Design a protein around this ligand. Sequence first.
Ligand SMILES: O=c1cccccc1O
Ligand SMILES: [Zn+2]
Length: 257
Amino acid sequence: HWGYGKHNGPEHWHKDFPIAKGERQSPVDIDTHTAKYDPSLKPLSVSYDQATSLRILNNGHAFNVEFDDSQDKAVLKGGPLDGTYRLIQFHFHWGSLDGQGSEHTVDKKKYAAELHLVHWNTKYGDFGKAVQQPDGLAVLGIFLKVGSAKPGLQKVVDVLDSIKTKGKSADFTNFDPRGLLPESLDYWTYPGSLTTPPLLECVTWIVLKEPISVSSEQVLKFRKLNFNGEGEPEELMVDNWRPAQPLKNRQIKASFK
Ligand SMILES: O=c1cccccc1O
Ligand SMILES: [Zn+2]
């Protein structure tokens, strides 16, 4: 099945998921010079103070921190959105080396990692219905640069030893995702897709301008995870990023001048 290696990676995905070659694929390069300021965009509204994290899961391609999305506990609205979107999970994409790992790029620059906070449009009832819709998801993407530690990430780093292999999970209650956010909520936005199979074109992407800094030790710990299952040959979970896709004349809008 699909992965990130030479024989099952991004170049191969189109065979099983032909939408890989679609008109609104992600990620993209964000060319800042050609992203137009849109004064009709609203500020983003991030309402996470009642977030209820549940669990952390190594799914074979990343680690997901899952939330209770059966009520409006942690929601995203405003910005480019015209609905309420409920947080279901966050995860990261990252590199084998600090100079690569993000999915989006900014003027062709790669960050060491990218955080995705995944939300679904509550008018569709459930995540599974939302992913059948062109406005079903909103993903808040945040770049990670290596520098100082991010204290609000450390609780995630600490638990990774307990979910080293595919299919492992651990309780992860009482995690506050607000400690993963940068100061500014200035963003770019464009219509796109999931960046992993099934690559569905459901996503309003909201990419924050301001990176967060994480330490070299924090990202090192991410790189000790495994793609494989327990008892299988060890394959370090690194370079789980899709490269930038053709923009296909979409326009990226900026909330800021
Ligand atoms: O950002 C994501 C959102 C939803 C599902 C799968 C994979 C992803 O990388
Ligand atoms: Zn992702």
